[PDB]
Every structure is written in C-alpha cells, then in structure tokens.
Amino acid sequence: MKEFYLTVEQIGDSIFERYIDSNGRERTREVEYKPSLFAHCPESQATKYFDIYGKPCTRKLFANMRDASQWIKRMEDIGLEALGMDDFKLAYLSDTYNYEIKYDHTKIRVANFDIEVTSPDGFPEPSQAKHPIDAITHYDSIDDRFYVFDLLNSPYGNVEEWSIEIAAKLQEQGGDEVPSEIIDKIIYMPFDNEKELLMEYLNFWQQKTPVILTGWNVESFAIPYVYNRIKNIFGESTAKRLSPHRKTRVKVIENMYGSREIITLFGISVLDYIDLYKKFSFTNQPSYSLDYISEFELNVGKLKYDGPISKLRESNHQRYISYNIIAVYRVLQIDAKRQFINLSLDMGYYAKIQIQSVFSPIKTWDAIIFNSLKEQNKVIPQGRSHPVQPYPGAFVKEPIPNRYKYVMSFDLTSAYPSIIRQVNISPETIAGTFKVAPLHDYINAVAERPSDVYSCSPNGMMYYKDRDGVVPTEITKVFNQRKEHKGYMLAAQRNGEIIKEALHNPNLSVDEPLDVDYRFDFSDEIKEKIKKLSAKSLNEMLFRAQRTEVAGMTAQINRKALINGLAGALGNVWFRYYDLRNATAITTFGQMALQWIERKVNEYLNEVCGTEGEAFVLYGDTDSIYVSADKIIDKVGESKFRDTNHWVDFLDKFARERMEPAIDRGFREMCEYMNNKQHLMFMDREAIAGPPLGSKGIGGFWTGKKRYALNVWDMEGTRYAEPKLKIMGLETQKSSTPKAVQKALKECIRRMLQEGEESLQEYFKEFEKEFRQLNYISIASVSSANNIAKYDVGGFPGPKCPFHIRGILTYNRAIKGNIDAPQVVEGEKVYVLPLREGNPFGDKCIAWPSGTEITDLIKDDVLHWMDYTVLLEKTFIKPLEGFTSAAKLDYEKKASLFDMF
DNA sequence: TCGTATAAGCAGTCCGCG
DNA sequence: GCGGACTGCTTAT
Ligand SMILES: Nc1ncnc2c1ncn2[C@H]1C[C@H](O)[C@@H](COP(=O)(O)OP(=O)(O)OP(=O)(O)O)O1
Ligand SMILES: [Ca+2]
Ligand SMILES: [Ca+2]
Ligand SMILES: [Ca+2]
Ligand SMILES: [Ca+2]
Ligand SMILES: [Ca+2]
To answer: Among A151, A489, A743, A751, which is least packed by CB within 10 angstroms?
Structure first.
C-alpha cells in the first residue's frame, strides 16, 4: 500500500512523524528536515520558482528549521517579504506525501475514553486534580475492545468488583442493561490502589498509543485531569508519557471574556467529540451533556441513578462502572450515525494537515492552496497584518407580511463558490478596477458595460479570463465532492419516501429487509419487492435509508461549509489571502444576481399573465427567490385538479420547463454583461408549497425578513408521502424557546397552513387550558450565560443586568454556601423560569444549568412559585400573535351576529 | 465560547415622551 | 405603553 502519515510534529529542529508504512505497519521517525523559504530575486537570475504574481524567486535552503524561523525575523527587521510555507510540518507533509493520499482507517488507532472522579466538594478541577481517578474506560478501534480500569480502594470508599453478569441484566432484573453487542468486548481490570491503576494505564497507552483521541469533553476535562493527576502523584516526566514523543504544552485558550487551559499532547490528534458535534452537526442544542445529546441523536433513555454522582460510587459501584462503560459506547453510537471522525480524516488527508486542524477552515485552505501552488513551482505570499474592517454582505428583500397560498422557491446551487468560479475571483487573477455605477444601475442593465477584456464584479473589480485562479480551481474540486455526496443524500431521502408510502399497506408475513444500496434510487424490481414486505422489514429498511441519508448529509453539508468558509476566509485578517476587494467582489455580485433575477422573473411572469408591474417575487434572501404561484394555479383553475399531488406535479413541471429556462436565459445575459469567465449561476427550484387541495389551509406566511413558514409537498425533487413544514427563523426553530412551546407553536403553524383558522382556534383554546400541567423543564426558556461576574454586584443584579443573568444570581443566592449544589458555568447554557410576585427567592426569575433537574432543596419552591401566566404570554402568546396578525387571522374566535342564537 | 463571513430578527434594560 | 439606543443572544444565508 501507499504510505500515509498519522501525526506530525515540529520539536526544535526535528520533525516527529508517526505513519503507516508500505506494509501497513505503524512506525515513528525523527527527521532533521531542512525547510526552504523564498525571497524575490532579479529578472537576470534564472529560476524555476515564481510567486503567484509571476515575479521570480530564489529558494533558500536552511541548515535547520530554527535558521529558517530566524531568517523570517530578520527579513521583517529589513522590511522584505519572506515567502513560502512558514508552517514547516505542512511543508514536510507536502514533500513526504507528494500525491493524493489514500488512507486506510482500519490501521488508524482511534481511542475513545472517559474517566470518573469522585469529588465530595464540588466539581473536580482538572488543573488541580486533587481527587483520585476511580474509573477509566478506554475503547480501542483496532482491538475493538472496551478496556475498563476500575479502582476498588479509595479514600472515598472501598468497593467490590464490578460484575459483568449484573451489567448485562435488564434494569427490571436490577441490572444495568449494558448492550449485549458490547458485553463480549469488555476487558475488565480491577486495581487495589490508584498508583497501580495509573501505571498500568500508561503501560497500556504505550502499547496502544492513540492516533485520534476522542470522547466527550476529553480536551477540557479527561485529558487535563489525567495529565495533572499523574503529574501530582508521579511527577512531570511520567505524565509526559501520554505523548509518544514525551512532549506536552499547557495551551491557553482565550475568548472574549476570560481564558481556559488545555494540555497539548505532541504526536496525538485530539478531536473532542463535543467539538466535532458543535462544528459538524448543524444543530444548536439547549444542552451539550452526553445524556442530552444521546437522547436527541439515538433516542436512548436517560442513564438513571439515585442520589448525587458524588455518592454513586460508594452507594452503587456496580452502576457507577456500567454507566462509565455505556458513556463511552454512546459516543461510538453517535459517531456510527453522524460519521464525524470519517469526515475529519477525509478532509485532513485531502488538505495534508494535522487532522485536528479540520476545526480551522483557514488552516485547511492554507494547506490546500499551498499544495496546489507548489505543484506548479509557485511560491505562496507571506502572511501580513491587517486591521479588522467591516464589509457588506448579502441582500435581503423586505417581504410584505401576509399569508401566501401557493409558493415556488428557487436558489443558487453553492452560491458564493459559484460566483468565485464564474467571475474567477482569486488573489492572483486581479486585473484591475473599473469605475463603478450605483448597484441599481447594473441590476436594471442601464450602467455601462464594465469591461470588454476582463471578468467583472459590480464592486469595481476586474479579473483575468485567460486562466483559472488557484481559488476557483481548488474550490471546484471540493464543490464536485460536495455534489457527489448530496446526490447520495437525496437518493436516500427519495428512497425513504418510497418506504413510507409502502408502510401504508404492510403485508402479513415473516420476511427480511432487502439488501440494497440506499445511496441510489430504487430500481423497479426493488420497488415491487418493497410493496410485498412486512412492517417490521419496511421499518428496518426505513431506519437504514435514514442512516444513509444522515451519512450523505454529513459528507455533503460540511463540504458545503468548507467551500463557503473559503469565501468567508477572504474577509478574515488571519487568512494568507485576506483581501476585502475579493470578499466584496463576491458579496456585491451576489446582491446584483438576486435583484437581477428578481427583475427577470417578474418580467417573465407578467408576460405569461399579460399583466404590467405585478410583483410575483415576494421574498428573497442572499441567493433565493420566492415566487407567488396563485395566478399560475388560477389560470388552470383549482377544479381541474384531481388531488393535491396533481397540482404539485403541474407546478413541478411549470418550474422545470418554463421558469428555469427563463431564469437561465436571464443569468446568461448577466454573465455577458459582466463579461464573466463562465456561466455558473444555476438557480434550481427548491420548494413547491401550498394548502392541501380543498382545505381551508393558508399554505404559507411571512412575518418579516428571515421569518416564514411554508407547507411543502416537494423539496429539491423529493416528493413527500406527507407534507412537511419548512419553518425558518420563527420560535419553533430557536433553541431558546421552551421545548413544549416549540411543539405547540409548530402545531399552531401546521393547523394554520393545512387546516385553517378554526382548527387553529380549537388548538389554541386547548393549549391555554392545559399547559400548566406541562413539566417545568419543557416550559423553561434557554439562554447562553456570559459575563455572570460583570453583572454581579454583591450577589445582586448590577445596572443593565440581562434577564437570564438575573435568574442565575437568584439561583446563586438560593444555593449559597453549598459546595455540593451544581454551579452555573460561565459561558454554558441555563434553563430560565419567571417567578410570581412575592416569592421567597426575592426576584422575578431563576436560572439553573441546562439539561439538568434543578437541585432538590429549591425545586419544590421553584415549582410552587413558577409564573405560568408570564411564561405563556412571553413564549407562546406573543410569538403566536406575531404569526396570526402576519397571516391575517385570529387565534381566538371573534364575536358575530350568530351569537344572538 | 479557539475554530470562515454578513444580515437581521426578538427579548430585555433604560428612559424619554409634555 | 411604545420606540429608540444599546446589550445579549440567536438565527438565515
Ligand atoms: N455558514 C456560512 N458561512 C459563510 N457563508 C455562508 C454560510 N451560509 C451561507 N453562506 C453564504 C454562502 C452561500 O453560498 C450563500 C447561500 O447559502 P445557501 O443557499 O445556504 O448555500 P449554498 O448556495 O452555498 O449551497 P446550496 O447548493 O445547498 O444552496 O450564503
Ligand atoms: Ca461521569
Ligand atoms: Ca443556495
Ligand atoms: Ca438546489
Ligand atoms: Ca404491501
Ligand atoms: Ca438559499
């Protein structure tokens, strides 16, 4: 096999590299790598190295890496550009793996671990590590085993061995219900004392050294705790054995308000799963506890125990150890579904970076562009300092708040990357500028043609047409990857809808799910067999289809995120290719493209409707248009349609055969107007929306910019078995809205769009009547809590104190003195409830850590004093009033003359 | 919340508004 | 009461 790196580090003048050799074995080596950097040289000096602008460069080979670094410093002192890749390990990788990397994940040791630490005095601080580590479960991907290190004797209690038999048993048998599929994979090791546990762990670690290290909060908790605990007991040298090169750094992570410390382990790639999830999941969650995320992702129940976690080991060590094991398994189960590790390896090897750098699109793109340019003997520019400057972004149309019955939406495929490719926007493709007219002059095609030579953006920039820039070239490669995976995702989704339809008529037989590839549209033969399957087989097939779709989504959406991140990076001062001329060239072209096509679509439809000056485009945001289709439906007449699916087909056909060709012609004209390199504005139909045929449903509504709801029948070619709501911006979509309130608001919207005013009125009346019975957590608001200390004046709210922060201070007074009560962590999320007048807490609200039950000594009081009236008005009634007034209907039945009877 | 971008919504505090 | 200035938070793209 072809070799591939596992990890790479610079330590002084040495590169330390772990890698897989040509025989598939893991090796480590130290290489005294001699980097090269570049300086501009005279024309007369014959060379093969040129900067991105075509100026000649001489290569400077250094005796070692420190010499290269010192040289850069001296070039700054002289005031001359020092060109080349200044991150020497990236240059090393580029030299050592000069080809597209093929990797074999089965040879990469992925370690998933979790530790337990009993603490009788609050949260066990990793930087102090003053409490014994009493459990470690460490899953190894190569062995496919869970290694369990269990402390039987502690100053906090001596316990019996954990029992695998009891662990396997049902909760109803008094067991822990450790999944049977992992029971045979557990290797249990009990220890008489902590010193031996930790020494054995380190010896084990040496034998099975993680390449990728992950788990839940491992970077912020498990790793620093293990490091500092070993350090305290044995000393520094022993703790450094967690690094295969025996090198570690305390690394300070700074944000806006305060900073935290982590331990960098040289030669390990730490991908904390909480961070993987936050970057790649595209969720915003009320809580990020593993229990909360596992429930969300996997639909598994809460890991239940009685009493505090600080007493769980002594009261029920059996359960304590089982839950540690299950906690490790939960992360593996999340990864089996979401496939974020697979994603990270894919992108990391593609860019030729340390795998952990996938968290940084700037580093990712710096490496991609460097490797690309190097292939042509081109030399990258030096990074420069820039002040942070604001710059303009997208255009958003102000909608008229209203109901909108029939709607067709269109938007650009990969808008910003497509603009980059069309205009040829790149550091080295800048050809000059032209004299800019007001944007509206280009939108209405009255401005002078910008250039007859170069490709233009309406911000004034001109670009070469003779060759693609490196940014267009490299963005296209990742875009094509994105396109392939989205194809699989959409196929799996359409396949899912086939199975849902068949589930209306399941067969009465015992059979098996079909062995199929869900990434491809089911053949007629598969469809026929599906129609003869049992519900059990169909449901299992549905689950598999949905898992395929999830895998597709992960692969496609994060590749989309990467390419959109390159457009974004052009406007970040730390990017090597930061340039507000290019950043604004993209965003300004985008504004033009939207409003240009708005005009063209309005013109086209007014033509087929024989009208003048009527606005068919009701809304647009960045790269999208929403077209009122009422007149299209009304030209055929609702009575001519057999059912809902019939008019959906008709609008589908109209969008595809009439609108899209008109859109394409309009953009082709715009391309010529701007003299662009290549027409790549592809605005395909997204949604076909409307009420069910013959219902009183309103179809859709807008309340304002970025706030709307649509009843969708077909989304990007997926024809649903059941209509699906597309809701954007409204409170149903906000993590801050109470869970039960999101649910009720969604049902109000569903009723509005599908059934109409009366149905909405019936539901509202019932919700108002019953809601006080809802669990307090389900009706708590959620907020991130920043700057708790800033607004804390003697335990009371300072001036301008935010409502949620007030809630926290209330909580802090009510739990004061308790070392055992959960503390609210700065920067994390809290549940927030309002409090009735004259409550014992002495303020109008209370907040506590999100994803948790509020501590028992104030729970009963919080429940007694909960202000349901304020809660209902603020979270439910206010938003609903917004929805209904926009839609021009009433959530409460108005009096009429009929009441006289 | 270490980690690409801008536009823009709503909640809440403070305080004016005769 | 509402709205503007402002802070805080959270979305859509
Ligand atoms: N997270 C982001 N960071 C930077 N720019 C973004 C982000 N999200 C959206 N944009 C910008 C770039 C996008 O091309 C443009 C339109 O967004 P959107 O329609 O969601 O995706 P897209 O047009 O890139 O892909 P798709 O093909 O899925 O529509 O808005
Ligand atoms: Ca735990
Ligand atoms: Ca788009
Ligand atoms: Ca599309
Ligand atoms: Ca059937
Ligand atoms: Ca869009």
So the answer is: A743
What are the tokens at A581? 């001329």
| Residues within 5 Å of ion ligand 6, judged at the Cβ atom | A 411, 623-624
CA R_g for chain A: 31
Residue keyed to tokens 């549940």: A831
CA A883-A884-A889 angle, to 5 degrees, is 155
What stretch of H or E contains A402? strand A402-403
Q: Is the minimum distance from the CB of A778 to strand C below 7 Å? A: no
Which candidate, A858, A825, A824, places its Cα nearest to that of A841? A858
Ligand nearest the Cα of residue A118 is 2
Would you call A129 exposed, middle or buried from its count of C-beta atoms within 10 A (0-12, 13-18, 19+)?
buried
The b-or-e profile of A326-365 (16+ CB within 10 A means b, else e) is bbbbbbbbbbeebbbbebbbbbbbbbbbbbbbbbbbbbbb
* Closest nt by CA–C1' to A827: B1
**Which residue lies nearest B5, CA-to-C1' measured?**
A568
Nearest ligand 1 atom to the CA of A412 is 23
Q: Is A144 exposed, middle or buried (0-12, 13-18, 19+ CB in 10 A)?
A: exposed
Alpha helices by DSSP H, listed for A300-414, are 309-315, 317-338, 340-351, 361-374
C-alpha A531/C-alpha A498 separation (Å) is 9
Contact A311, A134 (CB under 8 A): no
Could you identify the atom of ligand 1 that is nearest to the CA of residue A413?
A: 27
Q: Do residues A567 and A586 touch, judged by C-beta distance below 8 A?
A: yes
Nearest to A714 by CA among A404, A493, A545, A521: A493
Helix, strand, coil tally for chain A in percent (to 5): 45, 20, 35
Domains annotated on chain A, with CATH: 1-108+340-382 (3.30.342.10), 109-339 (3.30.420.10), 383-468+573-729 (3.90.1600.10), 469-572 (1.10.287.690), 730-774+867-889 (1.20.1280.300), 775-866 (3.40.1820.10)
Cα separation, A786 vs A285, in Å, equals: 17
Residue with CA closest to ligand 1 atom 2:
A564
Q: Could you tell me the distance, in angstroms and rounded to a whole number, from the CA of residue A830 to the centre of ligand 2?
A: 20
Shortest-distance ligand to the CA of residue A530: 5
> A781: which 2 tokens?
């608001």
Alpha-carbon distances of A174 from A166, A177, A182, A185, A291, rounded to whole Å: 7, 9, 19, 22, 21
Query: CB under 8 Å to A637, separation ≥6 — which residues?
Result: none
Nearest to A783 by CA among A835, A823, A832, A710: A832
Listed as ranges, the nucleotides of chain C within 7 A of a protein C-beta are 7-13
Alpha-carbon distances of A281 from A285, A335, A783, rounded to whole Å: 10, 11, 20
> What letter does residue A889 receive in the DSSP assignment?
-
Residues 64-83 of A with CB under 7 A from strand C: none
- Ligand 5 centroid, distance to A507 Cα (angstroms): 5
Closest residue (CA) to C1' of nucleotide B14 is A800
**Nearest nucleotide (C1') to alpha carbon of A800:** B13
What whole-number distance in Å separates Cα of residue A101 and Cα of residue A351?
9
Question: What kind and span of H or E run contains A110?
Answer: strand A110-116
> What is the bridge-based pairing of β-strands A269-270 and A212-214?
parallel
- Joined together, the tokens standing for residue A134 give 């009493």
Q: What is the DSSP string of A597-647?
A: HHHHHHHHHHHHTT-SS---EEE-BSSEEEEE-HHHHHHH-GGG-SSHHHH
Q: What does the DSSP 8-state code read for residue A672? A: H
CB-defined site of ligand 1, < 6 Å: A 411-416, 560, 564, 567-568, 622-623
Determine the Cα–Cα distance for residues A380 and A49; give it in Å rounded to an integer. 10
- The CA A77 to ligand 1 mean position distance, Å, reads 42
Nucleotide nearest to A708 (CA to C1'): C12
